[PDB]
Amino acid sequence: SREDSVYLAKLAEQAERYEEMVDSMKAVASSGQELSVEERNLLSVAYKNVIGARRASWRIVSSIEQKEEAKDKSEHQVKLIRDYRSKIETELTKICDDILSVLDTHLIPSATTGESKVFYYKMKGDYHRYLAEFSSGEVRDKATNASLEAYKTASEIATTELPPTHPIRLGLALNFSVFYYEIQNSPDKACHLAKQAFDDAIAELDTLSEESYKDSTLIMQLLRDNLTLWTSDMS
Amino acid sequence: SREDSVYLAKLAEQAERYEEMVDSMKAVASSGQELSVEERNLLSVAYKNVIGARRASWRIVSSIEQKEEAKDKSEHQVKLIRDYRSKIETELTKICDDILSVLDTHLIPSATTGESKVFYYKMKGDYHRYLAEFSSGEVRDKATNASLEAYKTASEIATTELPPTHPIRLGLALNFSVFYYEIQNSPDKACHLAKQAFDDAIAELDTLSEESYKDSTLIMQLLRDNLTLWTSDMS
Numbered sequence: 154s155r156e157d158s159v160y161l162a163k164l165a166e167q168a169e170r171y172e173e174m175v176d177s178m179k180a181v182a183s184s185g186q187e188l189s190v191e192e193r194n195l196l197s198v199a200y201k202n203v204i205g206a207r208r209a210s211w212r213i214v215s216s217i218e219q220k221e222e223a224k225d226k227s228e229h230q231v232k233l234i235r236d237y238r239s240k241i242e243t244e245l246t247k248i249c250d251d252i253l254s255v256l257d258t259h260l261i262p263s264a265t266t267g268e269s270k271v272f273y274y275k276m277k278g279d280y281h282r283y284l285a286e287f288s289s290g291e292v293r294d295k296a297t298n299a300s301l302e303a304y305k306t307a308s309e310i311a312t313t314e315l316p317p318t319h320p321i322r323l324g325l326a327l328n329f330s331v332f333y334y335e336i337q338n339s340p341d342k343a344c345h346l347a348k349q350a351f352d353d354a355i356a357e358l359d360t361l362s363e364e365s366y367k368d369s370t371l372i373m374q375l376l377r378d379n380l381t382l383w384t385s386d387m388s
Numbered sequence: 389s390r391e392d393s394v395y396l397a398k399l400a401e402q403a404e405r406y407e408e409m410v411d412s413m414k415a416v417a418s419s420g421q422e423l424s425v426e427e428r429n430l431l432s433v434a435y436k437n438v439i440g441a442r443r444a445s446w447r448i449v450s451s452i453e454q455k456e457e458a459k460d461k462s463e464h465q466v467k468l469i470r471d472y473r474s475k476i477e478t479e480l481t482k483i484c485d486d487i488l489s490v491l492d493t494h495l496i497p498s499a500t501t502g503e504s505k506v507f508y509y510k511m512k513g514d515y516h517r518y519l520a521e522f523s524s525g526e527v528r529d530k531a532t533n534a535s536l537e538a539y540k541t542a543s544e545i546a547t548t549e550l551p552p553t554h555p556i557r558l559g560l561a562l563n564f565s566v567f568y569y570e571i572q573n574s575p576d577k578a579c580h581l582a583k584q585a586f587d588d589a590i591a592e593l594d595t596l597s598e599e600s601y602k603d604s605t606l607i608m609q610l611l612r613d614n615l616t617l618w619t620s621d622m623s
Contacts, residue, residue, distance in 0.1 A: 167452060
C-alpha cells in the first residue's frame with residue numbers, strides 16, 4: 154500500500170534509519186503519481202541523509218589519505234586508504250545514480266506544477282553536483298555540466314512560476330550558488346545569485362503568512378550565512 | 389592480511405562506518421590469536437556503535453508505538469509501528485547473537501590474561517543485557533540470567549586479578565551496576581556495587597601514572613554520575 158509506505162518513511166525518519174526511508178519513498182515515487190508536497194520533502198530528506206553520511210565519510214577518509222601521503226614512506230598504507238575511499242565513492246555513485254534515475258524516469262516527467270518541476274530539477278542539480286565533488290576529468294566535467302543545466306532549468310521555471318519568497322525558489326538559489334562557489338569556483342556568480350535571491354525575497358516578506366514567512370526566512374538566513382562566509386574568504 | 393584488517397577497522401571508525409568496522413574486527417577476532425589491548429577496544433567500539441544505533445532506533449519507535457496506542461482508534465497504524473519495531477528487534481538479536489558467538493567460540497576460550505578474560509565476560513554480560521532490554525518472558529529471563537552469570541564471572545576474575553583502579557574492572561562495575569538498576573530493577577545492588585567500585589579505586593588513585601590515572605578517573609566519573617542519578621530517582 155502507498156499510504157503505508159509513506160507512514161513507514163516517516164517512522165524511519167524518526168528512527169534515523171534513512172536507507173529504509175529511501176526504500177519507502179523510492180517505492181512511492183516510482184508510481185505514475187505525482188508526489189504531494191509532504192512526500193517530495195520526505196523523498197528529498199531521505200536521500201539527503203543517505204548521501205550526506207557518505208559525503209561526510211568521504212571527506213574524512215580523503216583528509217586522512219592526504220595526511221598519510223605527506224609522511225611519504227607509507228605506500229602500502231596509502232593504498233589501503235585509496236581503496237577504501239574508492240569503496241565510498243562507489244557507494245556515492247550508486248546513491249546518486251539511484252535518485253537521478255528516479256528523477257529522470259518518474260518524477261520530472263510526471264511533474265505538472267511549477268513547484269514540483271523546480272523541486273525536481275533542483276534535486277537533479279544537487280545529485281550531479283555531489284557526483285562532481287569527488288570525480289575527476291571527463292566524469293567530473295560531465296557531472297558539472299549536467300548539474301549546471303539542471304539548476305538553470307530549475308531557475309528559469311522558478312523565475313517565471315514561483316514568487317521570490319518561495320522556499321523552493323530560495324532553496325534553489327542556495328544550492329545553485331553553492332554549486333557556483335564550490336564546484337565551478339566562481340565567486341562572483343555565487344555571490345550575485347545568493348544576493349539577488351535574498352534581496353528579491355526581502356521585498357515581499359511583508360506579504361507572507363506566519364508559516365510562509367518562517368519557511369522563507371529560514372532559507373534566507375542560510376543564504377546570508379553563505380554570503381557572509383564567502384565575502385570573508387575572498388579577503 | 390591481519391594488520392590490514394585492523395588498519396581498515398581504524399579507518400572505518402574515523403569514517404563512522406561501524407558495520408564495516410565490525411566486519412574487519414570480527415575477521416581479526418575469528419583467528420586463534422588473542423587480541424591486543426588496542427584490537428579488543430576496536431572490537432568493542434565497533435559493536436557498541438552498531439548496536440547503539442539500533443537501540444536508539446528501538447527506543448524511538450517504542451515511544452511512538454505507545455503514544456499511538458494511547459490515541460486508541462489507530463490499530464492499522466499501531467500494527468505498522470509494531471512490525472517496524474519487530475524488524476529492529478530482529479536486527480538487535482542478530483547483532484547480539486553475532487558478537488556473542490564470537491565471544492563464546494573465539495575470544496573467551498582463547499583468553500590467557502586476566503585483563504582479557506574480564507573484558508570478554510563483561511562484553512558477554514553487555515550483549516545478553518541488550519537482549520534482555522527488549523525481550524519478553526522466557527527469552528528475557530534467559531538473557532537476564534546469562535547476563536548476570538557472565539558479569540559475575542567477570543567480577544570474580546577482576547576481583548582477584550585486576551587492581552581496583554583498572555579501567556576494565558571499573559568499566560565492569562559500571563555496566564554491571566547498570567544491569568542491576570535497569571534490568572534487574574535492584575537499586576540497592578546497583579548503588580552498592582557502583583559505590584564500592586568507586587571507593588576501592590579512590591584508595592589507589594595516587595599510585596597511578598598520568599595515563600592510568602586519566603583512564604581510571606574517566607570511568608569513575610561515569611560511576612559517580614550514575615550514582616548521582618539513581619539516588620535522586622529513589623527520592
